Amino acid sequence: VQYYGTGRRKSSVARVRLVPGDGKIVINNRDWEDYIPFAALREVIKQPLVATETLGNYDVLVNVHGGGYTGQAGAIRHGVARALLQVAPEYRPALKSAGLLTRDPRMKERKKYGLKGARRAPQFSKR
Amino acid sequence: IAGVDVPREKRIVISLTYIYGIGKQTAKEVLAEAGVSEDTRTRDLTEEELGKIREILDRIKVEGDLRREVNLNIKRLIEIGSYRGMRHRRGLPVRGQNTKNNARTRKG
């Protein structure tokens, strides 16, 4: 009865559902603007909904739990992307061309056993 | 004005911070028991407010009177003979702060 999907970006995870409606985006039981007061997730959390010419296809209640400010904000997108694809298969091409369907594989790394962090080699002069 | 000379163009809380004993918080409370607004310029501290503040601060050590409160204790320490006195007369740390590297802001 709705378009379903899952999402992730950086260290976050999403389960976004595009249920039919008018465009009232609610993220994890909060308003469309109280959760994301800035404009960081204004187009980013909306361009996936506008990936095709389907901005008002579904007032997609969202679910982002765990991670970071854009990590969750990169997860609501990672859920809406497959939602249009699951609802309509032709929405896959927009996600593929738009550079939006890729599971972003970048992630934070380990810490070396003698450096001063994950990459910052120490400072030291001989003479 | 109030015990000493204060600026006449700054905020009262900021203005009232120029005495040896009137700081940044113990003067905020002191100016609170006097019933005077805290964010009004020192110009508005008229004769009524000036008298109120002067009566308020009359029991708090300030100005040059609050200077014997310091030297009497240090002179006492020097007279007593504690290691704190020996270091204070000499320039090293009175506490246990280590002085074989970077103890100079207190000793030249």
Partner: protein, 74 residues
């Protein structure tokens, strides 16, 4: 210390010497106990605190309150 139990001082220097100097009290003591605190009950008597080399004699004055019985011999 700055705790909620008040003062403290080693009993070896005080209990039978400093708290028991009342008769013929005109002598000093080689008090090796430098840990103790000079309580007000021991004003007048002398204790020879050990600074490492020799037990340095100490004089208990009125302003000695504010120091141990061995802190004046660094």
């Amino acid at each position: 210390r700055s705790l909620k139990k008040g003062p403290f001082v080693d009993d070896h220097l005080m209990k039978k010497v400093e708290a028991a100097a009342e008769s013929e009290k005109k002598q000093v003591i080689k008090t090796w106990s430098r840990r103790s605190t000079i309580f007000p009950t021991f004003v007048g008597q002398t204790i020879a605190v050990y600074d490492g080399r020799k037990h340095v004699p100490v004089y208990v004055q009125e302003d000695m309150v504010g120091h141990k019985l061995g802190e004046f011999a660094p």
